[PDB]
Design a protein around this ligand. Structure first.
Ligand SMILES: Cn1c(=O)c2cc(C(=O)NCCCN3CCCCCC3)sc2c2ccccc21
Ligand SMILES: Cn1c(=O)c2cc(C(=O)NCCCN3CCCCCC3)sc2c2ccccc21
Lengths: 333, 333
């Protein structure tokens, strides 16, 4: 897995493109420092699951030469940069404090929101910059860039839903230039997760690996895989929420524990949940409500069932390497 | 000029793509309302100079059929959406209040910064979505998307410079995770303007028009034009600053009046300028300093000289239609 070592080779390259700009040497030095810091800060320290998935899938769908490895590692790090851009955007939107156990990029003294927005856009453009640099001549250049386009669009729509579903505008169907009860249900939650997480996290890396491996687009796999991605997305996102509840409640996010507590709890407890926001007492009240009906074991049951369904789908893929890769990913948990 | 009427045909199309997503009808209705509002709010009300430039240049480099008009209007509105995304990003970054004589998109009750970031990214992706929808089969699809890539990258770098040049980090050349005197000069100002404004505002539309007209990329025009764009950018950006000073001072932006006042004023007045921020008294002090040395007439002299140089470059283009279009643009002022 010679993936991390390639990082510099790509990052520097992008900065080199900015170095070639018509600027004075001093400005060049300062911007190179700043953008190197940005990349090393927001694209490092994570598990890099997406890029590793890309690499594994490409290897298993294929004895691979150096140019292929370079292209694949570029794609993996491009997806990692997409993750970083989404992560910084979410830190800005959700008013988060710590990401990867360090201060959010927009919270730094030298980087306010003003810099954070511009930097997220820089990262998003750098993705396609590197893709153009390394894969324009490859037969799947348009397929890859359009896969990134669609994954980003669906993630953006999912983030919008995750942010604004309980807002006043989403209630009662015009806009004027609080929990919405009808909005909390498993169908809306599935929509939010699938668009928000499933595609960019799972579908996009798998599709990139398959396309680089030589699988034709019209192959039926690209739909089966999609379904699997959806399921996996669902699975992991629920897991994520399970980790959060053990600041979704603070930001009034529609979460799996909320929906299941609402389903299980009585009407007075539904009213109590509705009444409970940036206040510790309300958060602990909702945590106690969750712990009363023991939603933490319902998550275990859901994990079992969803993993069963995912494995059933994987066995229906009928492709040895991709099946092994996805089974390994699920075994990671 | 059948440009505005096409707007809906493109906007709806993009929303239709989002409608095709796997969502419930209610969520579909709400998101369609919200994104239609976003597009109609941030992409309408302006002069639409960039798109009109695209259309005029394409027409003059060419008796044009319907598919060509559709593609060209799509490109023009894509550049307008790029303008809107940059405009909303700048409103977020500079903490502005009114844009196009109405509340900034991020200031609305139903749209905070959280929604504004996601919406700017949505608009940026919608640009390439429409480009793919309308021009993927055209021979210049990659050229156009890469032109957009580079224009956006240079605009992002220019915005970063315009925002952070006077910051502490830019002084003395590492980052720790006030006016910088050495930074204010005509060379740094030229860099900031050229990257920030010249390319996306002028070079990008001209290049799109020429490429759609059938001009080969390796033609020498694509460099002469670049120079002209630079000059024009410079010109107009200075004009823009002249309009602002008649909130650049509030946000501590490096502006043409600041540099020229520093050049003309004595050392005590340089210290006074440095000492003067979100305070009315300081702003009026700097305005009085500007009005003392009458920088408002130095702007007139600069306008004359820069227009002369731009016209000299245009006469050196040696292309009738593009020369006429650029002369008309300069006559707009
Ligand atoms: C391949 N692989 C993965 O792809 C994946 C994804 C995961 C996740 O929890 N994602 C939620 C993040 C929500 N963001 C949405 C974007 C918009 C804003 C940011 C917020 S865990 C995970 C994983 C775990 C172990 C092994 C492999 C894995
Ligand atoms: C074709 N045409 C133009 O292209 C143009 C551009 C103009 C301008 O003042 N731009 C500054 C805007 C700075 N933004 C930078 C992006 C990053 C953040 C936003 C801030 S005026 C103008 C113009 C005027 C009359 C006729 C034609 C024209």
């Amino acid at each position: 897995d010679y993936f991390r070592s390639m990082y510099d080779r790509y990052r520097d390259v992008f900065i080199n493109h900015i170095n070639d700009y018509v600027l004075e040497d001093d400005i060049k030095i300062i911007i190179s420092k700043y953008y190197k810091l940005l990349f090393d800060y927001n694209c490092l320290g994570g598990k890099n699951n997406r890029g590793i998935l890309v690499i594994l899938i490409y290897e298993y769908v294929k004895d691979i030469n150096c140019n292929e490895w370079e292209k694949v590692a570029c794609i993996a790090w491009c997806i990692e940069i997409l993750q970083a851009s989404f992560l910084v955007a979410d830190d800005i939107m959700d008013k988060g404090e710590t990401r990867r156990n360090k201060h959010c990029w927009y919270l730094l003294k030298d980087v306010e929101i003003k810099n954070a927005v511009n930097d997220v856009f820089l990262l998003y453009n750098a993705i396609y910059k590197l893709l153009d640099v390394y894969l324009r001549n490859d037969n799947c250049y348009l397929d890859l860039i359009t896969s990134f386009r669609e994954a980003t669009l669906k993630t953006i729509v999912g983030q919008h839903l995750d942010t604004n579903i309980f807002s006043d505008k989403y209630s009662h169907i015009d806009i004027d230039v609080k929990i919405n009860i009808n909005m909390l249900n498993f169908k809306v939650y599935q929509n939010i997760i699938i668009h928000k997480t499933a595609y960019y996290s799972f579908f996009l890396p798998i599709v990139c690996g398959m396309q680089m491996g030589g699988i034709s687009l019209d192959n039926l796999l690209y739909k089966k895989v999609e379904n699997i991605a959806i399921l996996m997305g669902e699975y992991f996102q629920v897991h994520d929420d399970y980790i959060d509840t053990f600041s979704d409640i603070q930001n009034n996010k529609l979460t799996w524990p909320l929906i299941k507590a609402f389903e299980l709890c009585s009407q007075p407890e539904k009213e109590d949940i509705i009444r409970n926001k940036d206040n510790v007492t309300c958060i602990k009240f909702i945590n106690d409500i969750y712990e009363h009906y023991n939603i933490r074991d319902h998550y275990v049951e859901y994990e079992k069932k969803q993993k069963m369904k995912i494995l059933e789908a994987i066995n229906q893929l009928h492709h040895e390497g991709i099946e092994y890769v996805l089974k390994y990913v699920m075994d990671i948990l």
